[PDB]
C-alpha cells in the first residue's frame, strides 16, 4: 500500500542516504529509471548487491504512459520502490507520479538525497545567487534551440549566475561535455550577437559531482574550451558578477586565473 | 591527513548518504556544527551512535573565528570530518573554509547530503523555475531587513518561483517560522508599496522536509498566514506563474484552492 520515491544521489552506488538504502532492503517490489540522468560512477548490478533486491528497469515510456500498469498495481498489495538518480523530483516529470497514485489510492513518500542542483555548492558560488536554470540541448536536423543562451542572459544583467544542465543521450549513455556546450554557446552567441558568451566569459565546470575528486575548474572560454575535463558527467556554469569571496574560492580551488578578481567582481 | 567536510542531511540521522557515514566512521576525529539548520527529527546522540565517534559540536565563534586552531591542527596527522545539516555548502559560509584549509596545507574533501535547496522539489514546483533565493531575517533593534521582497518583486516579475529560506537562532533556540515570515513581508509590502506581497498572494509552505511526512500546504496568505504547519523548521515559497502541471500538483498533493488550477496564460 505503499510507493518511496528514493533518490540515489550524484555520482555512485553509496550516493543514497542511509534511509533510502534501508527503505529500499524492506521493499518487496524495487523498480528505477535511468532516463532522467545516469548514475556514471558506478553500474546497476553494483546498485543491486548494494540494496540487495532486483531492481527492475523502467523506460521513459514505461514510466509516462504505463506508470499505473507497472509499478501502482502492485504498490497497492506491497511496499514498493521508484528509484531515480539525484534527488526525487527534481526533474520535472516526477512530481505528477505522485498524483498518479493518489488516484490509485496508493500511499506514497519521498527519500531525498543530493541533487547536482544543490551541490553546485562546491564550485564557491553563493546558492543564493543561482538564477533561472537551464539544459544545453544538441541540436538536430533544422531544430536549433537556443533558450538556454536566454536563460543565461537574463540571469547575467541580475548579476544572477546560470546552472547549464547538459544533454545527456540516456540510452545510449552519451553525455555532452562542457566542451560542446561551449561550443554551441559561442555558435549561438555568433548568431544572436547579445553579447552573452563569448571567447572572454568566464565559465565553471563541475565534472563528476559526488565523486572524491570531482573536477572543479574555473576559466575564461578561449581558455578552457578546448581543456580535458575528465569523465563524466559535466555540468557547466555562467557566473553572473562575482561576490570577492566566490572570486577567491575560484581561484583558490578551481585553478581561475588571478584577473577574474578584476574582472569578474 | 584529510578534512571532510560532510553533510548530514535535511531532518535525521539517516540522512546522510552511504558514502558521507563510511567515512565518517572511519575518521580519528569528527566535529560538527549544528547553527547553520535544524534537524527536527534527530538528536546529538543518535548521530553519535550511528557514526560510532564522539562528535566534538562547535559554535558559530569557534568556526568562524578558529576553525584553523580548533579543526585543522588535528587534520595534518589525522583523518577528520566536519559534519553540518542538510549540505555543508549550502547557505553558509563554509565554502570559504577550504580556503583555510589548503592554506594550512590540508587537503579538504564533500560529501554532499539532500539540501532544502533541492528538497522544494517536492512541493511539485518546477526546480528550474527558481530564481534567486533570499533569506527573511528577523529585525532587531532599529533595523527591519528588506532586501528578500526586493527578490520576490524581481522574480515574480520574470514568472520565477522565489526560495526563502527563514532565520534561525540556534544558541536562542529560535526558529523562525513560515507565520512570521509572512507577517514580516505583510510590512515590508505595507512600506513599500509593490504590490509584491499581500493577503492574496499564493505561497507554498514546506516544513520538515526529509520527514517522511513533512507539511507541504499552499494557499493565500490570508488563509494561510494563521495556520498551524508544525514544528520547525519551515520554508516559505513564493511562486511565481505557474504551469498547469504545477497548479495541479499545489492542489491534489498541497490542498490549494482548486482555482489556481485555472491559470490566466
Ligand atoms: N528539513 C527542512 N525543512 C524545511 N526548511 C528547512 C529544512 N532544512 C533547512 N531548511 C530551511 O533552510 C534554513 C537553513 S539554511 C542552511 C541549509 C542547509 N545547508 C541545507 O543544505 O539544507 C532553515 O532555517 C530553513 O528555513
Not at 80 to 105: C, M, N, Q, S
Request: charged content about 25%; proline content about 4%; hydrophobic content about 45%.
Amino acid at each position: 500500500m505503499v510507493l518511496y520515491f528514493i533518490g540515489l544521489g550524484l555520482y555512485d552506488e553509496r550516493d543514497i542516504t542511509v534511509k533510502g538504502l534501508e527503505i529500499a532492503k524492506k521493499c518487496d517490489y524495487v523498480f528505477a529509471e535511468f532516463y532522467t540522468s545516469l548514475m556514471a560512477g558506478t553500474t546497476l548490478g553494483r546498485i543491486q548487491k548494494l540494496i540487495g533486491k532486483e531492481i527492475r528497469v523502467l523506460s521513459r515510456e514505461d514510466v509516462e504512459l504505463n506508470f499505473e500498469n507497472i509499478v501502482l498495481p502492485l504498490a497497492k498489495e506491497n511496499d514498493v520502490a521508484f528509484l531515480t538518480p539525484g534527488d526525487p523530483l527534481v526533474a520535472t516529470t516526477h512530481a505528477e507520479l505522485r498524483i498518479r497514485a493518489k488516484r490509485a489510492g496508493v500511499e506514497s513518500y519521498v527519500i531525498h538525497a543530493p541533487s547536482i542542483y544543490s551541490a553546485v555548492g562546491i564550485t564557491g558560488l553563493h546558492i543564493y545567487k543561482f538564477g533561472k536554470s537551464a539544459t544545453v540541448a544538441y541540436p538536430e536536423g533544422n531544430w536549433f534551440p537556443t533558450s538556454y543562451y536566454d536563460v543565461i542572459k537574463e540571469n547575467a544583467e541580475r548579476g544572477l549566475h546560470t546552472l547549464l544542465f547538459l544533454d545527456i543521450k540516456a540510452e545510449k549513455r552519451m553525455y555532452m561535455t562542457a566542451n560542446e556546450a561551449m561550443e554551441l554557446l559561442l555558435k549561438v552567441e555568433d548568431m544572436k550577437k547579445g553579447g552573452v558568451f563569448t571567447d572572454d566569459t568566464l565559465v565553471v565546470v563541475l565534472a563528476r559531482a559526488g565523486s572524491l575528486n570531482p573536477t572543479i575548474r574555473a576559466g575564461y572560454v578561449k581558455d578552457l574550451i578546448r581543456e580535458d575535463f575528465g569523465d563524466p558527467p559535466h555540468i557547466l556554469i555562467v557566473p553572473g558578477k562575482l561576490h570577492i569571496v566566490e572570486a577567491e574560492y575560484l581561484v583558490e580551488i578551481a585553478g581561475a586565473p588571478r584577473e577574474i578578481m578584476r574582472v569578474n567582481v
